[PDB]
């Protein structure tokens, strides 16, 4: 029974953080919550927070309000791999029904290198950085994720036709890892083709690995295929075995305390959390109990949406997770 640094965050942060804990022990989970506040000071994040995370290794983070803490937590814990598994959800139906993609985004260098120069008046050069080190590391993580999560194919996504030196070296590191891991089927594809086919037949894609800006855009389009950021789990993996799993929707301050929110997304990042540790049994139950709640009917939130409030939704998940 280990401890998980909890970061409720602002607006609807606390309510959906309450809903996740309620379901987490309604379901026998060997997890106890060590709440914490994260915030820039002096910048920095508090002593309070840096040492919980460097002790527990596992955090779950709600919607923070808006130095970028997105960027702070990345640089403070070396969050180098953004993971977003998108799965169509029965009951919450979009025009796309067959989706099951995992996007794996390099999260340190790439187009978000922070280097821009004004070359002269009216002429800006923004510098994209691609390194042997980081590309190899996100590729190793991509293939390791594919095995441990029983995944058949890993596609590298690139534009090495246009950006030959940089996207090329990213690709070169994906190739070297793939020849050292023939268990998993590897292909390459241009970003524009991946975009073109995604909105036509998303079902043909398995694990997508790609550098920073492409991963930023694709992860969002995929989540748009399954229903939005209100239903999307996300995780970030760092150095020395730290990992932070999170909401990525807004705080929704205008309904912040009216039992009206929907905790699906953070609850699913928690599920994704357990799976990361171990505890698949608990994950499968919580997840299945969630999936069955959304499909069965009018116990639905307003934003998904029915006319039931957040802890009616949450309590039915508790009701059903107790009957494995």
């Amino acid at each position: 029974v280990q401890t998980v640094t909890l970061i409720p965050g602002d607006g609807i942060g606390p309510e959906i953080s309450a809903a996740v804990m309620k379901i987490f022990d309604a379901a026998k989970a060997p997890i106890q919550w060590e709440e914490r506040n994260v915030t820039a000071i002096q910048w920095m994040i508090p002593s309070e927070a840096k040492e919980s995370m460097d002790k527990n290794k596992m955090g779950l983070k709600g919607p923070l309000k808006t130095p970028s803490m997105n960027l702070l937590l990345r640089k403070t814990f070396d969050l180098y791999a953004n993971v977003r598994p998108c799965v169509s959800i029965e009951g919450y139906k979009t025009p796309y029904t067959d989706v099951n993609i995992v996007t794996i985004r390099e999260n340190t260098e790439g187009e978000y290198s922070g280097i821009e120069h004004v070359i002269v008046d009216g002429v800006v050069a923004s510098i994209k950085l691609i390194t042997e080190g980081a590309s190899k590391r996100i590729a190793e993580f991509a293939f390791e994720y594919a095995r441990n999560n029983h995944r058949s194919n890993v596609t590298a996504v690139h534009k090495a036709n246009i950006m030959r030196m940089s996207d090329g070296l990213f690709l070169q590191k994906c190739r070297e890892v793939a020849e050292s891991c023939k268990d998993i089927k590897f292909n390459e594809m241009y970003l524009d083709t991946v975009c073109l086919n995604m909105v036509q037949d998303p079902s043909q894609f398995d694990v997508l690995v790609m550098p920073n800006l492409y991963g930023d855009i694709l992860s969002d389009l995929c989540a748009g295929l399954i229903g939005g950021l209100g239903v999307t789990p996300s995780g970030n993996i760092g150095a020395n075995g730290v990992a932070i799993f999170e909401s990525v929707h807004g705080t929704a301050p205008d309904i912040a305390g009216k039992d009206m929110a929907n905790p699906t997304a953070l609850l699913l990042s928690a599920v994704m959390m357990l799976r990361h540790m171990g505890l698949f049994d608990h994950a499968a139950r919580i997840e299945a109990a969630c999936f069955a709640t959304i499909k069965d009917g009018k116990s639905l939130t307003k934003d998904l949406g029915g006319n039931a409030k957040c802890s009616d939704f949450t309590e039915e998940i508790c009701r059903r997770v107790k009957d494995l």
Binding site: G122, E132, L191, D220, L221, A223
Partner: protein, 335 residues
């Protein structure tokens, strides 16, 4: 009679140029194609003489030259070399829902205006030390102003009402910021046109759910690559949508998605619609508007008939059967 440069390209390009000639013959279009070819050769003499022919002719219709991304960075994409050498700064494509092609989303009518010469297509890279590669995306004021002018003039002349600038200025603060601000400046000269803006991530999310909210869109080069292909796919795929490339004097027409289609080439299954619509836009540009309209109504009429559909859009017919139907629709328009 006009003389047009024709670059057949790779993949489905060659076969589809033949049907373009064939359709122009039946319609008696006063246009003579002057073909130039571009090989795989690392040497640039092919691509350079294609450029000089377009300088001579001012108008061209082209397939897609394949780019081998396994060759060294010195071997740059010829499609890009053409685009930038000739300074065709505006990539324009028009994605509109085709009533005969039923997809997940209806009521789509989006003009996309894409800066076509600058950006992350500048081909400026270097390895400072072993394993450390830098690439310089270039945004300038003169080119951001230029593209923004075009999108707004387009929006007005075609009676649209909203331009949406697409960008990553919240993270690419200087580069994308400069582009966004050039748009804003132009916006202030078109008070009658609603100006909005949106981040490229959230734009792709809105496209796959509510793409009816977009009217005209303008953006820098890579984001256009993404948005063109997203919207091409939404309305039915790469065989349907034409694209144009405009400079101040030169103009070059093609398929919107810029794909060679090597995996379906030479099996008489390619969809000729994108290529045909591209050649009508070329006819409009040449002020041959009556020929453009005859052929465009024919091709569109054929898409209405499910029986004419190629496999890219769920059908079973051949290219040649589609071209047959198109010619049948022209052969009654002109007597």
């Amino acid at each position: 009679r006009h003389t047009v440069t024709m670059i057949p390209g790779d993949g489905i390009g060659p076969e589809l140029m033949l049907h373009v000639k064939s359709v122009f013959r039946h319609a008696c279009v006063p246009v003579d194609f002057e073909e130039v070819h571009v090989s795989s050769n690392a040497d640039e003499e092919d691509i350079r003489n294609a450029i000089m022919a377009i300088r001579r002719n001012r108008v061209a219709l082209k397939g897609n030259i394949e780019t081998n991304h396994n060759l060294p960075p010195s071997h740059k994409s010829r499609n890009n070399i053409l685009r930038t050498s000739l300074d065709l700064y505006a990539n324009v494509i028009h994605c509109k829902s085709l009533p005969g092609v039923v997809t997940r989303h209806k009521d789509i009518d989006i003009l996309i205006v894409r800066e076509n010469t600058e950006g992350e297509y500048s081909s400026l890279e270097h390895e400072s030390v072993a394993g450390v590669v830098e690439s310089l995306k270039i945004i300038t004021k003169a080119k951001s102003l230029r593209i923004a002018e075009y999108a707004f003039k387009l929006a007005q002349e075609s009676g649209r009402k909203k331009v949406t600038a697409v960008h990553k200025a919240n993270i690419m603060k200087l580069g994308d910021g400069l582009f966004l601000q050039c748009c804003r400046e132009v916006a202030a000269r078109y008070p009658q046109i609603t100006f909005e803006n949106m981040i490229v991530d959230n734009t792709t999310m809105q496209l796959v759910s509510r793409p009816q909210q977009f009217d005209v869109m303008v953006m820098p080069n890579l984001y256009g690559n993404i948005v063109n292909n997203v919207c091409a796919g939404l309305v039915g795929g790469p065989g349907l949508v034409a694209g144009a490339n405009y400079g101040h004097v030169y103009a070059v027409f093609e398929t919107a998605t810029r794909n060679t289609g090597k995996s379906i080439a030479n099996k008489n299954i390619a969809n000729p619609t994108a290529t045909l619509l591209a050649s009508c836009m070329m006819l409009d540009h040449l002020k041959l508007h009556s020929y453009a309209t005859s052929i465009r109504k024919a091709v569109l009429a054929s898409m209405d008939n499910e029986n004419m559909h190629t496999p890219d859009i769920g059908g079973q017919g051949t290219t040649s059967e589609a071209i047959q139907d198109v010619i049948r629709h022209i052969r009654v328009i002109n007597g």
